[PDB]
Design a protein around this ligand. Sequence first.
Ligand SMILES: *[C@@H]1O[C@H](CO[C@@H]2O[C@@H](C)[C@@H](O)[C@@H](O)[C@@H]2O)[C@@H](O[C@@H]2O[C@H](CO)[C@@H](O[C@@H]3O[C@H](CO[C@H]4O[C@H](CO)[C@@H](O)[C@H](O)[C@@H]4O[C@@H]4O[C@H](CO)[C@@H](O[C@@H]5O[C@H](CO)[C@H](O)[C@H](O)[C@H]5O)[C@H](O)[C@H]4NC(C)=O)[C@@H](O)[C@H](O)[C@@H]3O)[C@H](O)[C@H]2NC(C)=O)[C@H](O)[C@H]1NC(C)=O
Ligand SMILES: *[C@@H]1O[C@H](CO[C@@H]2O[C@@H](C)[C@@H](O)[C@@H](O)[C@@H]2O)[C@@H](O)[C@H](O)[C@H]1NC(C)=O
Lengths: 210, 210
Amino acid sequence: GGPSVFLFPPKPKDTLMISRTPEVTCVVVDVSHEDPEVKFNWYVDGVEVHNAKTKPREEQYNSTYRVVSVLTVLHQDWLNGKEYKCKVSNKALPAPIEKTISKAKGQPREPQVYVYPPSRDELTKNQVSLTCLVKGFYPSDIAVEWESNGQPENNYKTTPPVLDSDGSFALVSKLTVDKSRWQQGNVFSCSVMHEALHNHYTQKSLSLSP
Amino acid sequence: GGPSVFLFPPKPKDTLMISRTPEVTCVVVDVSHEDPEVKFNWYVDGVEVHNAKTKPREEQYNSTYRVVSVLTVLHQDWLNGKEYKCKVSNKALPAPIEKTISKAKGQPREPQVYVLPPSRDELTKNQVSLLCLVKGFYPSDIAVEWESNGQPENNYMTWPPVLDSDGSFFLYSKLTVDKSRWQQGNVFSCSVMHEALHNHYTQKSLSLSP
Ligand SMILES: *[C@@H]1O[C@H](CO[C@@H]2O[C@@H](C)[C@@H](O)[C@@H](O)[C@@H]2O)[C@@H](O[C@@H]2O[C@H](CO)[C@@H](O[C@@H]3O[C@H](CO[C@H]4O[C@H](CO)[C@@H](O)[C@H](O)[C@@H]4O[C@@H]4O[C@H](CO)[C@@H](O[C@@H]5O[C@H](CO)[C@H](O)[C@H](O)[C@H]5O)[C@H](O)[C@H]4NC(C)=O)[C@@H](O)[C@H](O)[C@@H]3O)[C@H](O)[C@H]2NC(C)=O)[C@H](O)[C@H]1NC(C)=O
Ligand SMILES: *[C@@H]1O[C@H](CO[C@@H]2O[C@@H](C)[C@@H](O)[C@@H](O)[C@@H]2O)[C@@H](O)[C@H](O)[C@H]1NC(C)=O
């Protein structure tokens, strides 16, 4: 019993793309009204930082509070495997609970990215399926998104990555588009962001030839 | 105290192909030497049935008994949503344990099956990928396989069903083949089994087009 703590990594797009803002998130739940006092300490490979921000306690429908501290990280430190430990001390806690987290381990492997046009068979339908295969990648942390004419084309689902027969990961993203738009000759591109890619980024395109 | 029961359903493929035998399996573990008699009572939509096969108890390395009862189900009973209950009595229980399982609920929707050849970009590799897209199905229970030349294929992986925006599921399977085989004109076939297909089965084939 007493309060519990969960420790969450940044989003992979946030670590990979230099303008974005990667954060590690330390969540405290089951904080009591009678002992609501929660202090956070943060450490990066065992050294303390003070740039974190702790949110005010928040009451849950279950009568306990939720406490959070968000610690923005340097993209480089996360990608280099630096260790992030959040320390939670609370009256109800005879001993501090410490969770640590860091990037997924393993030697990087550059994803191979392919796009696939719609089946001949599928053209009978009001919509068509553009397919993006990403395989050979390691670790599994990855972001895959679609767009057309610079604009997010968000009408898509993606398999979570799963292990292939050579020990790497693969996944497939499916964007659904109007056959007409496909027929209108519009270009669609698959965007892939992964630590192994140069610039962390590659985009592959397809369209119907005039 | 108490021994515990776990009740497992049949494999979807076994419920779909008439040549196969679908089974509901009731597994009682953590039974003791002092109270070893286990009796099963099986009900299908509440009507007791008498045809299950029970196996002799077998001692586990924790010095407990494992006792498994196998009930053959009729394909169409399962597909029609019948409820199978296994009841297990033992003297170390405050009373019998009951467990009931049945097929996933929801209006079934017919899979749509597409096959896509490898992208021209991939042909410059030692192995290639052929994709099988199966979408718009419901429930998620499904079996997908690949063969060629009258042999099944050994080199595929199939991602879990993904819930699509329209409430249905889709999934992909990826068959990897040496480019030579592909370039040699060999035919590859994706076979999909699902309750909402006529005959519970469809197959789509592709080959290299010169
Ligand atoms: C004492 O020991 C027992 C037995 O354990 C064994 O012996 C001990 C000494 C050790 O050596 C162990 O390493 C060894 O396993 C132990 O029993 C276990 O108890 C725990 C709970 O406390 C059970 O845990 C549950 O497991 C559920 C999932 O179990 C399935 O998957 C696991 C692998 O993840 C298998 O090990 C299980 O056997 C079971 O496998 C499933 O089995 C069914 C029925 O046979 C298969 O379905 C049927 O398949 C056939 C074809 O084969 C047809 O398709 C049929 O139509 C179909 O019905 C099914 O395919 C298979 N699945 C897989 C993935 O293989 C889980 O859901 C629960 O939430 C829970 O975790 C555990 O199962 C159980 N082990 C058993 C029975 O072997 C005791 O706990 C120990 N006691 C103490 C006090 O220590
Ligand atoms: C108390 O609630 C915490 C927050 O859980 C979230 O909101 C609660 C009320 C539920 O609605 C749940 O759906 C959400 O995940 C939990 O993390 C915590 O474990 C809960 N504590 C207890 C003792 O139940």
